[PDB]
Design a protein around this ligand. Structure first.
Ligand code: ZOQ
Length: 257
């Protein structure tokens, strides 16, 4: 159900970084500012999961989800064409501004992400890759009288398509049931809150893959956020039992209170 974009309409500009099995570039579509997510040459099973993401994203609309225009085919290159979100990934931005980002700013972002995940939950759709890298800043919201404005990115290559090693690499955003449903986004949401409160540094980042796996193997409790305003929420979200995690309806109602 994805849209087709033709090679003649897109211009590739500067390299922005890399995703899971992708190279990401600024681009131009026909003329719109866009981001081009170029899939590494891959087997059908990766290519399919890429196209499944493009389809899921073409079917949803939300003020806090970024837009996907479609997929272009440039020979062996599968390219997703997406909205350019002005100030880029949130985690990189928070690490730059660490010590400048007030608690109220982080609560706005938490409500905005919970709102987007609430809408996906009602559609019975799973994002699968909720992390700070996949949150993009449309408005910075640090100046006076301004509020930030985030937009959640597409999940990229789907979670079920990736390797065990890539899953270990996503700890602690990766829900523990996924190491060997909509409930996994509640874990990812809780981990992203820890990352946001820790100014873009997520727990267990310095640790090795076998250490990360050991943390999950022993079901060790993740840390508490650096603000009591979210300690209860993140604790309910970061429970190893998926059925004991709150719904996003509840999460959102608590964050606005
Ligand atoms: C987001 N991922 C981690 S990533 O694609 O692997 C990736 C990796 C590195 C940089 C970017 C990046 C830097 N500046 C952006 C401005 N807008 C966007 N737009 C989108 O992603 C919209 C479809 C959602 C992306 C970037 C993206």
């Amino acid at each position: 159900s994805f849209h087709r974009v033709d090679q003649k309409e897109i211009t590739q500009l500067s390299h922005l970084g890399q995703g899971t099995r992708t190279n990401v570039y600024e681009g131009r579509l026909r003329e719109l500012r866009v981001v081009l997510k170029v899939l590494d040459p891959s087997h059908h099973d990766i290519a399919l999961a890429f196209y499944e993401t493009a389809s899921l994203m073409s079917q949803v609309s939300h003020t806090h989800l970024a837009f996907v225009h479609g997929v272009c085919v440039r020979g062996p290159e599968n390219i997703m064409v997406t909205e350019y979100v002005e100030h880029g990934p949130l985690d990189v931005w928070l690490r730059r501004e660490r010590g400048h980002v007030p608690m109220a700013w982080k609560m706005v972002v938490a409500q905005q992400l919970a709102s987007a995940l609430s809408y996906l939950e009602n559609k019975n759709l799973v994002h699968g890759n909720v992390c700070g890298r996949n949150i993009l800043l449309a408005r910075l919201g640090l100046a006076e009288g301004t509020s930030p404005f985030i937009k959640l990115s597409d999940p990229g290559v789907g979670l079920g398509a990736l390797s065990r090693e890539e899953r270990v690499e996503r700890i602690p955003w990766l829900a523990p049931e996924c190491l060997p449903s909509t409930a996994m986004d509640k874990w990812g949401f809780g981990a992203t809150l820890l990352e946001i409160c820790f100014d873009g540094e997520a727990p267990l980042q310095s640790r090795s893959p076998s250490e990360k796996e050991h943390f999950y193997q022993r079901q060790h409790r993740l840390p508490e956020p650096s603000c009591p305003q979210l300690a209860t929420l993140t604790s309910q979200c970061l429970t190893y039992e998926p059925t004991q995690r709150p719904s996003f309806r509840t999460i959102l109602r608590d964050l606005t209170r």
